[PDB]
Amino acid sequence: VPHKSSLPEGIRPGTVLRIRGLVPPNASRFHVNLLCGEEQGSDAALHFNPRLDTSEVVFNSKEQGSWGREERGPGVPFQRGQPFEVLIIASDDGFKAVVGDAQYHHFRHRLPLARVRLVEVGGDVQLDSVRIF
Amino acid sequence: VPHKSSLPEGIRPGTVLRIRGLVPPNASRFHVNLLCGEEQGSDAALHFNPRLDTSEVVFNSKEQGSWGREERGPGVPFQRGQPFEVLIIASDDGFKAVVGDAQYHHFRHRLPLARVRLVEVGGDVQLDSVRIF
Ligand SMILES: CO[C@@H]1O[C@H](COS(=O)(=O)O)[C@@H](O)[C@H](O[C@@H]2O[C@H](CO)[C@H](O)[C@H](O)[C@H]2O)[C@H]1NC(C)=O
Ligand SMILES: CO[C@@H]1O[C@H](COS(=O)(=O)O)[C@@H](O)[C@H](O[C@@H]2O[C@H](CO)[C@H](O)[C@H](O)[C@H]2O)[C@H]1NC(C)=O
């Protein structure tokens, strides 16, 4: 069951998104989206996509219906059947992705932080909790 | 403990200080300090001080050698003999304290965030992890 929730006051430099979860033994890929609307085709300020099937972690944005320029993280800090903790930190420069006990990747802002209205966590993932700090 | 770490690039909005450890069986109090210098006698932008004995968590700053006005968090989110996790998040407004799963307290800036250069953790506390993202 996915987490999809509205952010009334949007997000700000200092906003922290904490995702504690579990990658299922049959999992292929799951996603963490910071969205600008409620639609399935809304703009995405951030698309965080761990892919167990291809052993990649793809960062991207989405504007006017098109995925932007793909960025990729160093290695895959995720594993089928293993728990994870992910911090997504909105700074004034971009989003910092923290997995485990280390800084994983920095994703520079392509869309203004002011446009982010919604958080989505879904895909092949089992959730313990999703927090907005 | 006493963990003393420098922050060379300083800290900007979007910085997270994660402290993991254990509160001792007969702990009285411990502290987390963000100092505006490399020495302990430096000014404190933030004094995070859980007091297990008087059952309170005191927030304050130190300027020219004297404490500012004391703030107190809602109750004590710490239990003696139990492990804890604390997030200290820097934003535009101030510092956001997160203990466990709950946003605990917002401490609005008194000293400029750009003055912070050192993290100090000490007191009755067994540290397991101190990290800055
Ligand atoms: C042109 O098709 C697109 O190719 C990308 C690169 O594929 S790869 O195998 O060389 O890595 C794919 O990433 C892309 O897949 C889509 O990627 C976006 C993020 O950029 C998002 O994760 C989508 O869920 C994913 O399908 C693929 N696009 C399509 C339409 O297939
Ligand atoms: C009147 O002296 C000051 O009283 C504060 C509240 O007293 S209490 O009875 O409600 O507990 C004390 O917190 C304060 O102690 C100092 O507080 C600062 C943070 O503001 C810091 O924790 C110091 O380590 C602590 O001594 C006390 N002030 C002084 C100067 O003793």
Swiss-Prot record, chains A, B:
What role does this protein play? Could be involved in cell-cell and/or cell-matrix interactions necessary for normal growth control. Pro-apoptotic protein that functions intracellularly upstream of JNK activation and cytochrome c release.
Q: Galectin domain: from which residue to which, for each copy?
A: 3-133
Chief localization: cytoplasm
Where in or outside the cell is it found?
Cytoplasm; Nucleus; Secreted
Q: Name one GO molecular function term.
A: carbohydrate binding
| Keyword Iron listed | no
Q: What induces it?
A: By p53/TP53.
Binding residues annotated for a beta-D-galactoside, in chain numbering: W67, G68, R69, E70, E71, R72, G73
How is this protein named in the record?
Answer: Galectin-7
Arranged from A to Z, the UniProt key words for this protein are: Apoptosis, Cytoplasm, Lectin, Nucleus, Secreted
Q: Which tissues is this chain's protein expressed in?
A: Mainly expressed in stratified squamous epithelium.
Top-level taxon of origin: Eukaryota
Originating gene: LGALS7
**Subunit:** Monomer.
